[PDB]
Amino acid sequence: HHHHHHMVHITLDRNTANSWLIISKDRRQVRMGDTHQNVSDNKERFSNYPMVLGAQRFSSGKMYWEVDVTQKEAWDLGVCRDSVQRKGQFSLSPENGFWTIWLWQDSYEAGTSPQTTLHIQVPPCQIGIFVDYEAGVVSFYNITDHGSLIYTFSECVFAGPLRPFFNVGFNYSGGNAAPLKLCPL
Numbered sequence: 001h002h003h004h005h006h007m008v009h010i011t012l013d014r015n016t017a018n019s020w021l022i023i024s025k026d027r028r029q030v031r032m033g034d035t036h037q038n039v040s041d042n043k044e045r046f047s048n049y050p051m052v053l054g055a056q057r058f059s060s061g062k063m064y065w066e067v068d069v070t071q072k073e074a075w076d077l078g079v080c081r082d083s084v085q086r087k088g089q090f091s092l093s094p095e096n097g098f099w100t101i102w103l104w105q106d107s108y109e110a111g112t113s114p115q116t117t118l119h120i121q122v123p124p125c126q127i128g129i130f131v132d133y134e135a136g137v138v139s140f141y142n143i144t145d146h147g148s149l150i151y152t153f154s155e156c157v158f159a160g161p162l163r164p165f166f167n168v169g170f171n172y173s174g175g176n177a178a179p180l181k182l183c184p185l
């Protein structure tokens with residue numbers, strides 16, 4: 001792919017974070033804490049899952065960013081509508097305003113309804129995410145495997161401003177403590 005030139009500087013929005021997340025001073029890294037991180041509750045925070053949004057909102061154009069997932073066992077990445085549900089249980093699907101992929105139990109899947117099996121020969125350490133708002137496209141790239149395509153959501157009906165979306169996952173196993181990191185341009 002030749003999407004690198006649409007690179008955008010993404011930062012995390014603390015106010016949307018699950019109350020157990022720890023976001024770095026530069027707002028470029030996030031990990032699961034051991035405990036509640038001593039913040040007040042609000043209507044924006046994701047309650048059920050270790051999720052957080054980027055601060056940036058996109059309503060036009062082409063955007064590209066990269067995320068480091070080194071040594072994690074579980075995570076979700078992509079974009080979502082600014083107005084997605086924050087409280088209670090929900091599925092990651094385009095019907096609910098999410099365009100995502102994930103790792104879970106040694107398999108990679110795209111967040112369609114129902115979910116789609118991905119075919120990855122080289123487990124990624126960094127994922128590239130490309131959004132074309134006008135075209136209705138969200139694509140995922142394997143940066144570890146020379147940028148190979150992972151998955152393309154096409155004919156997307158965004159129906160609102162988009163925000164970068166992250167889930168660090170739970171750490172029941174003790175093998176999933178590592179952070180998600182936004183990689184430099």
Ligand SMILES: OCc1ccc(-n2cnc3ccccc32)cc1
Nearest residue numbers: 031032033034070071177178179
């Ligand atoms: O809660 C204990 C605790 C402390 C530090 C970290 N940690 C910070 N950056 C990391 C990068 C990779 C793996 C673990 C990392 C995790 C867990």
